[PDB]
XYZ file of C-alpha atoms in Angstrom:
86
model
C -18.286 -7.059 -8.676
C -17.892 -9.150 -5.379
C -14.484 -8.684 -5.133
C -13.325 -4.973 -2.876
C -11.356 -2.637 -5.007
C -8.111 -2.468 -3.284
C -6.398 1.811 -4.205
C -2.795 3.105 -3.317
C -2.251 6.168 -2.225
C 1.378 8.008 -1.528
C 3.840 10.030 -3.332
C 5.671 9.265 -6.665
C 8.907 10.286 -5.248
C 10.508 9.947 -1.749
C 14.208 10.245 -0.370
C 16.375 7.129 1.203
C 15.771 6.788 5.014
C 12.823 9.204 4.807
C 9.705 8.145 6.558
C 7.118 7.796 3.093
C 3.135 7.232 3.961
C 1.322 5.128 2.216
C -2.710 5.250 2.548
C -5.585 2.465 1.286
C -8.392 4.803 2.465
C -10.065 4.956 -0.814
C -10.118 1.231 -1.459
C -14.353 0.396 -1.030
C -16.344 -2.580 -1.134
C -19.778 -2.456 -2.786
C -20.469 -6.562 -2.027
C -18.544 -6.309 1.519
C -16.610 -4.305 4.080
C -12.979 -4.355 4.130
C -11.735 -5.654 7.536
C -7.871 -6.156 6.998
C -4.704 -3.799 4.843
C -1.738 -5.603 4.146
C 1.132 -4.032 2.567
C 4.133 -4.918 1.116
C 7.044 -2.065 0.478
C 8.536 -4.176 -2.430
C 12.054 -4.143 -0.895
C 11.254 -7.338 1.509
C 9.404 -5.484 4.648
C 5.385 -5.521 5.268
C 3.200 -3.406 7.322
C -0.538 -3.554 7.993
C -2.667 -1.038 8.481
C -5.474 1.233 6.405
C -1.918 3.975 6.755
C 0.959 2.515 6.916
C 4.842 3.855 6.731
C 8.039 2.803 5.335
C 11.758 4.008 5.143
C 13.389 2.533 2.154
C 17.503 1.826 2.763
C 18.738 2.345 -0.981
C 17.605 4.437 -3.604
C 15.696 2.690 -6.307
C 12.458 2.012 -7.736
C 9.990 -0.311 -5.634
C 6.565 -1.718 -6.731
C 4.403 -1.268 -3.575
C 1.468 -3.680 -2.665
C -1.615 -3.449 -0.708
C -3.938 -6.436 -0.517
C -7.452 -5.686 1.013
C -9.691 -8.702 2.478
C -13.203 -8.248 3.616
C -15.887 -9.781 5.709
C -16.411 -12.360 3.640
C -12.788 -13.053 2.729
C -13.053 -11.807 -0.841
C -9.553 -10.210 -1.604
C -8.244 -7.177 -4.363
C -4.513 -6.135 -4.702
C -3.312 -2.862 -6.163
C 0.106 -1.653 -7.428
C 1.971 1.794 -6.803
C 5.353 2.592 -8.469
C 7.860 4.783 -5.577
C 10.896 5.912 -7.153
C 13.487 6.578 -4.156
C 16.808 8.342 -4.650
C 19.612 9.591 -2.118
C-alpha cells in the first residue's frame, strides 16, 4: 500500500544497564522512501536513528516502538517485545 512498512529488529532478551541495539534496516517503502526512524524504548526515553541503542535501568518487560516517515510524510509503526532482567 502507500503507507512504508515500519520492522524491528534486536534481541528478545537483554541484561539491566547493558547497551541493547535496536535496528529498522529492513523497514521498505514500495510508494516512498523512508527519510526519518524514531524510536521509543517503552520505559520513557527516545532515540532516532535507522540503529539506535538503549540501556534499560530495571529489569522488566518493555514494548519497543519505531515509527518510520517518508518523503511524502506517509507514516508505519511496528512493535518489539524486550524482556530485561538483572
Amino acid at each position: 500500500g502507500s503507507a512504508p512498512i515500519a520492522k524491528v529488529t534486536g534481541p528478545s532478551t537483554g541484561a539491566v544497564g547493558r547497551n541493547i541495539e535496536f535496528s529498522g534496516k529492513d523497514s521498505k517503502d514500495e510508494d516512498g522512501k523512508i527519510v526519518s526512524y524514531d524510536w521509543d524504548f517503552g520505559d520513557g526515553a527516545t532515540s532516532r536513528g535507522k540503529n539506535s541503542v538503549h540501556a534499560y535501568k530495571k529489569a522488566g518487560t518493555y514494548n519497543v516502538t519505531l515509527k518510520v516517515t517518508d518523503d511524502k510524510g506517509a507514516t508505519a509503526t511496528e512493535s518489539f517485545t524486550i524482556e530485561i532482567k538483572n
